[PDB]
Structure 1
Amino acid sequence: ALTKSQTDRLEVLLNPKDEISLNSGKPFRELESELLSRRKKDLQQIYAEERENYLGKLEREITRFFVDRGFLEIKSPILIPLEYIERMGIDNDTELSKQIFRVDKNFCLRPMLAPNLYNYLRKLDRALPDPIKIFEIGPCYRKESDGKEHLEEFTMLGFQQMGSGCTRENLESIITDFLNHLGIDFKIVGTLDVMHGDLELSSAGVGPIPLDREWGIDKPWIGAGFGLERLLKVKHDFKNIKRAARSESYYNGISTNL
């Protein structure tokens, strides 16, 4: 009988496509040696043929989708003014107030993309024709309890359209085309949330809302934010989101501790 520590070890080495039973009557050393061989071959095959990291490759695929659909690609600061969090209505009653990674006295690691995209919408509205469509993909940071669905360092897609065409029907069409393009099953529930069973893939929004006026926004809008590691978790059927993260412990969901 395998110890719980031994099965922990084997579970690190197990990939979802594997058809191996850790409850069979094979000794630990030989189950471990066979999984080690499979995971080394998996890495050798990535190295010989494609060589692309899942997170980078997904970011490039989402980028092509949104650029093709008319959205401008934004790359804005990750280290943001702390004032942005308060100005988002995030006071001490919200959970998010307590999840902020603070840096120095005035800055933080952004936990969200809405403040930076608000600022781009306001500025670009003086120069671009209606509607204004933008999107960004990049790191976001939140303090979290340990959890199979949560990372403290994760990657967010955020997109927003402002001006004409900002209907709920148009917002659902973008989400629906987007996730059918990626091959990810979903349900939209309605403020709107895109779910994969009990896992939240996205929260989406329809403006105007009162908060817009703090950001100098006074036009209707639609938008949403998606976690890239959650999309990878669903797509590759990982049991824990850490398999999809920026990590020294996993490469494309394969253990690097061999």
Structure 2
Amino acid sequence: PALTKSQTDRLEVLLNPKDEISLNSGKPFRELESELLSRRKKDLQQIYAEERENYLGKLEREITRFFVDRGFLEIKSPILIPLEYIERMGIDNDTELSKQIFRVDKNFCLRPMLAPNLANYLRKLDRALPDPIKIFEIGPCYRKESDGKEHLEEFTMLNFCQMGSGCTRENLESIITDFLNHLGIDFKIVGDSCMVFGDTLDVMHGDLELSSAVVGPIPLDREWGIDKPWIGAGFGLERLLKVKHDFKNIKRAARSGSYYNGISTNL
């Protein structure tokens, strides 16, 4: 007998990349579902008995150690930000990226990226700290998105940046290379362009964009009081997890009540 779309969808929820099971081999749905439920319960029990760390939390901690050890100051800045930051970032209020903003009340929004808060920290810290200024942040960011296998509306960004000396393309590429080598992720760099920053160095794993990176200065700097060379890159943590664990859909990696470390919680 043949599987309905609802049945295939249920088996896909329970399937994991490490499995090799044919869903349409002719084996009945009831046996495929029971087999996968048993494998997933075993996987979750082993997590609970032996590791207990959340993939997103653990990856944030690993990345934090990497950057702290390399001289970058760990920032934790507001997630709920003034709506005025959007227009000030060059997100023209009828850009499709402008349509991606979650508004809160009348004058606030959920940050769609970490850059503006980090630009404010670079400016303020440069009055107190020796050259170069090196900072980074990891945390939640928010964008309205069309349904896709590589986009979440609530995701987790890493942005590291440096201002002052050493803010060259070669140093930016070297940091990205050291970082992704530390995580074991192969990549290439390709040129792209975006509305906020202009030309970017996009960090690609196959056709998947892991990061956009920028070498300043750029015209936007004046609007933020940035008056020195700078470099920076933003990475999505859920995309890194998707690569590391071979997930078919980024939802496996997200903050979710529906998956724990890529395992369905609907068991």
Q: Which runs of 5+ in 2 are unaligned?
A: 192-199
Give, in whole Å, the separation in 2 of the partners of 1:193 and 1:81.
28
Deviation at 1:116, TM superposition (A): 0.1
Give, in whole Å, the separation in 1 of the partners of 2:248 and 2:228.
42
CA contact 2:16–2:263 (8 Å) conserved in 1: yes
Structure 1 segments (4+ residues) deviating >4 Å? none
Deviation at 1:208, TM superposition (A): 0.8
SS at match of 1:248: coil
SS at match of 2:33: helix
> Cα deviation per residue 1:206-253 (whole Å; 9 max; x = unaligned)?
111111011111000010000000000111010000000000000000
> Cα deviation per residue 1:84-104 (whole Å; 9 max; x = unaligned)?
111101113432111000001
Deviation at 1:25, TM superposition (A): 2.2
Note if 1:113 corresponds to 2:114: yes
SS at match of 2:147: coil
CA contact 2:137–2:158 (8 Å) conserved in 1: yes
CA contact 2:134–2:163 (8 Å) conserved in 1: yes
> Cα deviation per residue 1:159-180 (whole Å; 9 max; x = unaligned)?
1100001010000000011001
TM-score scaled by length of structure 1: 0.99
Give, in whole Å, the separation in 2 of the partners of 1:78 and 1:125.
23
Matches within 5 A, 1:1-258: 1-190=2-191, 191-258=200-267
Give, in whole Å, the separation in 2 of the partners of 1:255 and 1:59.
22
Give, in whole Å, the separation in 1 of the partners of 2:156 and 2:39.
29
SS at match of 2:203: strand
**Percentage of matched positions with identical amino acids:** 98
Deviation at 1:4, TM superposition (A): 1.8
Give, in whole Å, the separation in 2 of the partners of 1:6 and 1:123.
56
Q: Which runs of 5+ in 1 are unaligned?
A: none
SS at match of 1:15: coil
SS at match of 2:256: coil
Give, in whole Å, the separation in 1 of the partners of 2:95 and 2:105.
22
Deviation at 1:146, TM superposition (A): 0.5
**CA shift in 2, pair 1:105/1:93, >3 Å:** closer
When structure 1 is superposed on structure 2, of 227-236 and 183-192 the one drifting more is 183-192
Give, in whole Å, the separation in 2 of the partners of 1:235 and 1:19.
18
> Cα deviation per residue 1:28-85 (whole Å; 9 max; x = unaligned)?
1011001000000000000000000000000000000000110000000000000111
Deviation at 1:196, TM superposition (A): 1.1
SS at match of 2:52: coil
CA contact 2:138–2:156 (8 Å) conserved in 1: yes
Deviation at 1:197, TM superposition (A): 1.3
Give, in whole Å, the separation in 1 of the partners of 2:132 and 2:4.
60
Give, in whole Å, the separation in 1 of the partners of 2:69 and 2:95.
37
CA contact 2:101–2:112 (8 Å) conserved in 1: yes
Deviation at 1:184, TM superposition (A): 1.1
RMSD (Å) for aligned C-alpha atoms = 0.7
CA contact 2:87–2:93 (8 Å) conserved in 1: no
Deviation at 1:2, TM superposition (A): 1.5
Deviation at 1:199, TM superposition (A): 1.1
Give, in whole Å, the separation in 2 of the partners of 1:104 and 1:94.
21
> Cα deviation per residue 1:181-218 (whole Å; 9 max; x = unaligned)?
00112111122100111111000001111110111110
SS at match of 2:135: strand
When structure 1 is superposed on structure 2, of 51-60 and 178-187 the one drifting more is 178-187
Give, in whole Å, the separation in 2 of the partners of 1:105 and 1:57.
35
Give, in whole Å, the separation in 2 of the partners of 1:207 and 1:94.
23
Deviation at 1:21, TM superposition (A): 1.1
When structure 1 is superposed on structure 2, of 233-242 and 93-102 the one drifting more is 93-102
SS at match of 1:130: coil
SS at match of 1:195: strand
SS at match of 2:222: helix
